[PDB]
């Protein structure tokens, strides 16, 4: 089978470690145990990034009126300059927006030898005086801890002098094993030092969308639909977010969790501290969107909202049904593989299958066992040496602000009715039988998959795209969306389908072989 073909060329030590990272879902074992969230094998050609990417590049960067200062040499900053397409606009047309900038202390040899804290102090004050942002972030990079720079103290000293918040993040690149450690680092500080610090009055039908970063305008498309039904979108963490909206994230009745991996820490901690329940949402694909909207309406249990929900679902589907039929005509029967970071491999699936495309192989770069198998397995997971030193924070109920949002008996009834409250299932559950999962997929692995399965298409990222396409196979990007979007929401399905059909039917695919051969 494919697993043995993938493993064959590995040297014995590597083969034994990689074997557990590849599993096949079957009828007899629908939910196989996988090994995930372990160190990358050196030299294996991984697609993984670092904890600084996960912290600064992913979770915090999209907060548009906070100045994010990279405390490091220049590359850490340069490489986070607009490559990740989180979209921002000035709040109410007038607010601050730093999306087009990157900020750094541009560490030099003298900072490595003598410490960088004075330059950091000076950079924080320069940012404050030039920009007067809502807050300042300071992000560690590889050298920072090792050269002895206490950024937590520099931040606190600066914050007291300048009168706005300064948040330090110890997201040195070698922490953890992937971007995932960086998510955790970000969530710890966001939860303890930002969320709940505001004092805005809560509105009716208030929801937050958690773990949604407005890539290519996704969040605005989901907000369009949600607002038409009648919800108030209180906060999106963190796509197009202001600092003040994050401060007021506690002013909601329900947390929607789009990316479980990156934001589950805050979801769980908000439930503990404030009583706000969460549901998994998926705003990608007609089926995911509809099930999410139906689940939300059941939670709020309001006749008007429930009726508007159906009216809007019918109207949005009718407007795109001709396109959906077209996609299925043009694509059915084709096969795909998907490789993303920690979430999209899963969320896009309801969509390809709706077009008649069969997904054979899926993987994550850095997802944990919970993402694959469901959170049911979280008791069995134990942290290894390489991720042990990421701080685990504990919250306690806020005596002033805690509320029972959905009474316990209603919680019981919703769960029996299939609403995924404060719970999550996993990519494996809704994948069909016979299909393969590869955790931390590497170049070798991807090439065996391509040679043995000959998929019509293989969705991945920028590092894999041209590798796949040089072999005559279409590779559309699931991170950057090939500079398009939105791919979320009802309009997203149409954008995704249109780009995919366009890619498949590009005439040059058939012109690769010259006529003299």
């Amino acid at each position: 089978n494919l697993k043995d073909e993938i493993l064959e060329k590995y040297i014995p030590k590597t083969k034994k470690t990689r074997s557990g990272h590849i599993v096949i879902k079957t009828e007899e074992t629908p939910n196989p145990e996988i090994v995930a969230n372990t160190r990358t094998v050196p030299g294996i050609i991984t697609a993984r990034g670092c904890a600084y990417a996960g912290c600064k590049g992913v979770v915090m960067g999209p907060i548009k009126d906070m100045v994010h200062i990279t405390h490091g040499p220049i590359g850490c900053s340069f490489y986070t300059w607009g490559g990740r397409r989180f979209k921002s606009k000035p709040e109410n047309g007038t607010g601050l927006n730093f999306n087009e900038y990157v900020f750094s202390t541009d560490m030099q040899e003298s900072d490595i030898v003598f410490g960088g804290v004075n330059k950091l102090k000076d950079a924080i004050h320069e940012a404050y005086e030039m920009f007067h942002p809502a807050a300042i972030g300071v992000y560690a990079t590889c050298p920072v801890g090792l050269i002895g720079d206490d950024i937590l103290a520099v931040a606190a000293t600066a914050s007291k002098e300048i009168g706005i918040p300064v948040h330090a993040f110890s997201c040195e690149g070698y922490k953890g094993v992937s971007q995932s450690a960086g998510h955790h680092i970000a969530n710890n500080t966001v939860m303890t030092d930002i969320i709940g610090k505001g004092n805005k009055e809560q509105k009716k039908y208030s929801i937050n969308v958690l773990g949604e970063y407005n890539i290519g305008g996704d969040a605005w498309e989901m907000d369009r639909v949600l607002e038409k039904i009648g919800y108030h979108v209180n906060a999106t963490l963190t796509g197009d977010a202001t600092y003040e909206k994050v401060q007021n994230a506690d002013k909601a009745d329900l947390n929607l969790v789009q990316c479980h991996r990156s934001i589950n820490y805050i979801a769980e901690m908000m439930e503990t501290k404030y009583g706000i329940p969460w549901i998994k949402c998926n705003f990608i694909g007609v089926d995911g969107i509809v099930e999410t909207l139906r689940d939300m309406a059941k939670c709020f249990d309001d006749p008007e909202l429930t009726k508007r929900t159906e009216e809007v679902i019918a109207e949005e589907i009718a407007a795109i049904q001709d396109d959906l039929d077209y996609f299925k005509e043009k694509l059915q029967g084709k096969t795909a593989c998907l490789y993303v970071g920690g979430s999209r491999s899963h969320t896009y699936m309801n969509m390809l299958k709706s077009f008649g495309v069969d997904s054979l192989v899926a993987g994550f770069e850095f997802a944990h066992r919970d993402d694959y198998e469901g959170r049911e397995v979280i008791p069995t997971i134990k942290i290894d040496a390489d991720s042990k030193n990421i701080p685990e924070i504990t919250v306690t109920p806020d005596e002033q602000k805690y509320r029972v949002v959905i009474p316990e008996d209603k919680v019981e009834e919703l769960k029996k009715a299939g609403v995924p409250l404060s719970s999550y299932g996993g990519m494996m559950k809704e994948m069909h039988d016979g299909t393969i999962l590869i955790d931390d997929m590497n170049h070798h692995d991807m090439e065996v998959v391509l040679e043995k399965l000959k998929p019509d298409m293989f969705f991945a990222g920028i590092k894999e795209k041209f590798v796949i396409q040089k072999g005559g196979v279409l590779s559309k990007q699931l991170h950057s969306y090939d500079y398009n979007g939105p791919y979320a929401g009802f309009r997203g399905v149409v954008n995704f389908g249109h780009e995919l059909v366009n890619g498949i039917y590009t005439p040059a695919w058939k012109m690769i072989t010259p006529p003299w051969k």
Partner: protein, 458 residues
């Protein structure tokens, strides 16, 4: 756009904004891809390798392969020796390159990792199969820029490979500097038109500008061959094109193998291409052929034919030092004015050379800055406007905000297709540059003129 950038300038001594450089390792990675059957290897945390591979793919719209030692918190305490030994075993078995070219990150440099020791230990243990090679350089990201990293990797190649064996090859070495594969192709084409045998290294032509054939080849057809890298020690002369990127390597090869070298400007524009052609002619006795002289004459013809659109135009330029020095001279040769001239790469040479050419042309009032950034240039432009902006992709924000005709140049260009097939060097590259510059100046004129001032002929 860029609404937070003020007109009123306050001195910034610590906060770097929108930089006009990146860190060493990608420059070493690029140099390493200019070796045939080479896998570049990033000795550090894997975030670096992923970022560096990514920028190359965004620029070239091609694959860019590299491996990493994938440091964890363990390596931060014990060093990366065990990681790189494990990497090399997996690399040779899974991917079978002929040579692994190692560079370092800010992490391994801060830790003081000892690559020569790990590499000898690997040799002793038999982890390096016979016929295969592992080389390295040190690329601290807190020193210099990506140009420095390229320079360091070229030195590493010389350190490990170049050997004077006494068998003269009759060749001239050429180190083309931190230029693109189309530029390397053009430089080779000129050597070949002059009938001068050569060895170019590094050479990313046929590696980062390659065809789609329907089969993916991990190691593309191009790249300088290891056997030819060894043979650089038997050459008659080394031409070092661009002092920042190329001199370290040329000087190293002089010390190691006694191959003398000559330093030349990156051959952009009239005098710099002329100096290159004349160096080739003087080194070999060979005459300049009619084909090259014709190309030069067509460039002159173009400069004169298009002159009215160029004279007195104020230009803002940002980029890498070798390229911006030569381009600024070309801008003067076109009759235009380098008004704001910036590199993010540190070093005295740029400041002296730009100052000197400005003085020679009688140009006063230009601002020249070493370790300047795009925020600096933007503020200068808000104070006194320009007619043309030349930079990498990141200038597009200033171009839109200030409505300035914009030419993409240098590294990285991530937002257009096929630029990696277009030389900027030589007389041919010079013609391409003039076309681009005049096109964007005329496009603006014709978009913005009143209807009654619209013209058929220009």
């Amino acid at each position: 756009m860029l609404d937070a950038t003020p007109k009123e300038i306050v001195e910034r001594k610590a906060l770097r904004i929108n930089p006009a450089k990146t860190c060493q390792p990608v420059g070493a990675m690029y140099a390493a891809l200019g070796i045939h059957n080479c896998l570049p290897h990033s000795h550090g945390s894997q975030g670096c390798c992923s970022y560096h591979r990514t920028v190359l793919s965004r620029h070239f719209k091609e694959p860019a392969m590299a491996s990493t030692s994938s440091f964890t918190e363990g390596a931060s305490v014990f060093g990366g020796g065990s990681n790189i030994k494990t990497a090399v075993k997996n690399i040779f078995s899974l991917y079978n390159p002929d040579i692994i070219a190692v560079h370092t990150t800010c992490l391994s440099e801060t830790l003081g990792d000892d690559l020569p020791t790990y590499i000898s230990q690997m040799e002793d243990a038999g982890s390096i199969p016979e016929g295969k090679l592992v080389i390295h350089t040190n690329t601290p990201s807190y020193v210099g820029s990506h140009v420095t990293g390229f320079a360091n990797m070229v030195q590493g190649i010389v350190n490990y490979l170049s050997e004077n064996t006494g068998a003269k090859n009759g060749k001239i070495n050429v180190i083309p500097g931190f230029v693109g594969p189309a530029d390397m192709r053009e430089i080779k084409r000129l050597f070949e038109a002059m009938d001068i045998p050569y060895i170019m290294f590094p050479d990313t032509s046929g590696v980062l500008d390659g065809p789609t054939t329907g089969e993916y080849k991990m190691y593309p057809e191009g790249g300088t061959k290891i056997e030819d890298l060894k043979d650089t020690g038997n050459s008659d002369l080394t031409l070092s094109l661009g002092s920042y990127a190329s001199d370290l390597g040329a000087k190293t090869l002089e010390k190691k193998c006694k191959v003398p070298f000559k330093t030349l400007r990156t051959p952009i524009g009239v005098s710099a291409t002329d100096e290159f052609i004349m160096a080739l002619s003087e080194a070999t006795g060979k005459e300049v052929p009619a084909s090259i002289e014709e190309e030069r004459g067509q460039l002159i013809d173009l400069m004169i034919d298009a002159q009215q659109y160029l004279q007195g135009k104020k230009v803002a330029l940002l980029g890498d030092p070798d390229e911006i020095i030569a381009l600024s001279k070309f801008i003067i040769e076109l009759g235009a004015i380098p008004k704001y001239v910036v590199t993010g790469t540190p070093g005295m040479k740029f400041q002296k050379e730009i100052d000197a050419m400005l003085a020679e042309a009688g140009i006063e009032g230009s601002k020249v800055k070493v370790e300047g950034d795009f925020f600096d240039v933007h503020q200068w432009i808000k104070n006194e406007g320009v007619d043309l902006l030349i930079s990498n992709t990141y200038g597009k924000f200033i171009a839109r905000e200030e409505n300035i005709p914009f030419v993409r140049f240098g590294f990285p260009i991530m937002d257009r297709y096929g630029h990696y097939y277009n030389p900027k060097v030589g007389y041919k590259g010079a013609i391409r540059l003039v076309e681009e510059i005049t096109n964007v100046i005329l496009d603006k004129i014709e978009r913005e003129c009143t209807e009654e001032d619209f013209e058929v002929v220009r």
